[PDB]
Design a protein around this ligand. Structure first.
Ligand code: MG
Ligand code: MG
Ligand code: MG
Ligand code: MG
Ligand code: MG
Ligand code: MG
Lengths: 371, 371
């Protein structure tokens, strides 16, 4: 584990894809992550974005989320793609770094090569109040920590997605306003042009990110045509789809097809697969979520919760970590124990027990009926 | 029973959820109450709102109620969410409290520290007509019941839902007017802005309440996308859904799914379940509804009506309380008896007997046919 747990084979395949992307040998190609749910597909796609760069746009959606009352399928996909396409701007900031020589209430700084007196404002004096070398950024303040020049320059790369720029140009309770969440079509075409001229001027760079679409089988034929068209664009992001369906109907038609994907799009897919998490992987993941939530848990508790993860889902086992720690705090305990796990397991149902919620009452009802 | 009866396990689970809400560990999470109908699900959700505060907005809808001739699905949900989001305003009222020293027809009040003469209007004199210490609110009147100052200040917190404000800004027979029941989209965005500036000024506070959606399986995929988006908002209420369906189709698609809910939304659900009411719980509830309706009922009558509640539904047994008391009043009786229960049970059908209404006539018809 160097960022995530398990899924060694899938990660290995993902690595080969990353080398295709860097070598440019993935033009007009997308990825499909087959496998059952809860096998770390999102982690795979997310880690691929990071592998391309520290600030690579990553967007994760679900197939069902393009059918909404707030947007059209076209608008939903457009936003999904514009969140995954980054614009990289270089900010050039001036930074005065030097050794403090004197303060007068004028600031005299020096490097090993020069010395200068800088006028001091009221905000600077106070800021300064809160003979050793430091840093000062212009139109800003101090950062107490030099040779060469006193005023040097530091670069600050900024990465912003096309969608982020859409919002800046075009929010509180906006969801509950009743009006759609569309972006004006004439605003995007203004931003598409502003970003086009900046790129021609060399002031901006386009960084195609990673768009992850889970439950891709929920898309209909119209939406797949959109995706297929996007893979032919030169600025498109790395498309990654996922589904646990084998063969199924193509929504919008009466035709079966592998994963419910039309052939024109299947033809350009690199298919990978994830397997279910082993007993070791499951406990490893559980341990990592406990540290993140600052939850101390007994070893007998890890064993039980791990078993629950294998018998139900890793998503469900993680829910119980938050619940068990509260049950632990109520009894003034210091670490989650097996009893805490048993209680929350009885209080909160997993998807399988929830779909058969009476079977537990029928058993009890019959068990008492025999008395 | 400290507010409601039975459902100890479900209430226990609900309590653990309340601690998550208060600790903030429920971001992007909703609740699903599985179980059969008539098991106090609404009471659970309602009690959770009260547990958050005395004036926490609570809204209860049914899945089928978003499909109407008066609103669109978007409008129906928007109102449902805006009824569940509260705006808390602090009114600062001046209250003169002091000991009456003299009346002149001028009112002289005093505390243990000061004394003052207040001019008296005609309304005040009359109001006063209807040497001991009392209270007076300015621009109002008297409340006959002190040290410190004479004019003190009392705070009156006011809680109003976003929807209540929508109506104030935007009624008799409005339902039968033929025109839709929409709120102008430009009016909400004006109220969203007025509430936004008040909050920035510290004059208003947003109180996310509790939205309860029963029969959630009636929602279609478009509506579930809306809910999933709302759980990502920071001002959203605590969403609570319910259904007695196990696995069923996702309306708008041809795919089965647990409770007819898409996975993107299932993934973020804490599932609880309610069991059927026991014989003891059922009689307890019946006793409480009698006191509320001011109905005296014999113990042999409670036993019979309780049995009816177990064999049909608690909703139906409660209907018979109103009917039986009228049958009781007709015969000039003082308390409902078994006979009163037997009569109304024969006069008013439960859902099961109503769906087989001829079987009672066929039995009688055949019974006479044999004579
Ligand atoms: Mg594995
Ligand atoms: Mg369709
Ligand atoms: Mg599960
Ligand atoms: Mg019970
Ligand atoms: Mg429909
Ligand atoms: Mg009934």
């Amino acid at each position: 584990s160097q960022g995530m747990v398990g899924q060694l084979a899938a990660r290995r395949a993902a690595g080969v894809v990353l080398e295709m992307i860097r070598e440019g040998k993935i033009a007009g190609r997308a990825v499909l992550i087959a496998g059952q749910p809860g096998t770390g597909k999102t982690a795979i796609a997310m880690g691929m974005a990071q592998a391309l760069g520290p600030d690579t746009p990553f967007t994760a959606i679900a197939g069902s989320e393009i059918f909404s009352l707030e947007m059209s399928k076209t608008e939903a996909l457009t936003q999904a793609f514009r969140r995954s396409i980054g614009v990289r701007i270089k900010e050039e900031t001036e930074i005065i770094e030097g050794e403090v020589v004197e303060i007068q209430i004028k600031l005299t700084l020096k490097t090993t090569e020069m010395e200068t007196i800088y006028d001091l404002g009221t905000k600077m004096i106070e800021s300064l109040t809160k003979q050793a070398g430091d840093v000062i950024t212009i139109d800003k303040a101090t950062g107490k920590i030099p040779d060469g020049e006193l005023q040097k320059r530091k670069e600050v790369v900024h990465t912003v997605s096309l969608h982020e720029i859409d919002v800046i140009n075009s929010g509180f309770l906006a969801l509950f306003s009743g009006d759609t969440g569309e972006i004006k079509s004439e605003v995007r075409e203004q931003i598409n042009a502003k970003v086009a001229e900046w790129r021609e001027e060399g002031k901006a760079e386009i960084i195609p990110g990673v768009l992850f679409i889970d439950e891709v089988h929920m898309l209909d034929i119209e939406s797949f045509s959109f995706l297929n068209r996007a893979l032919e664009s030169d600025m498109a992001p790395v498309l990654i789809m996922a589904t646990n369906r084998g063969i199924t109907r193509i929504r919008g038609t009466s035709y079966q097809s592998p994963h419910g994907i039309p052939i024109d799009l299947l033809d350009r897919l690199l298919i990978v697969s994830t397997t279910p998490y082993s007993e070791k992987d499951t406990k490893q993941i559980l341990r990592i979520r406990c540290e993140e939530e600052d939850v101390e848990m007994s070893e007998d508790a890890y064993t039980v919760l791990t078993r629950i993860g294998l018998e139900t889902s890793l998503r469900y086992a993680i829910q119980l970590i938050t619940a068990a720690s509260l049950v632990c705090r109520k009894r003034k305990g210091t670490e989650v124990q097996v009893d805490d796990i048993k209680r929350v397991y009885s209080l909160f149902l997993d998807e399988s027990r929830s779909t058969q919620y009476m079977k537990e009452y029928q058993d009890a009802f019959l068990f008492n009926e025999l008395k």
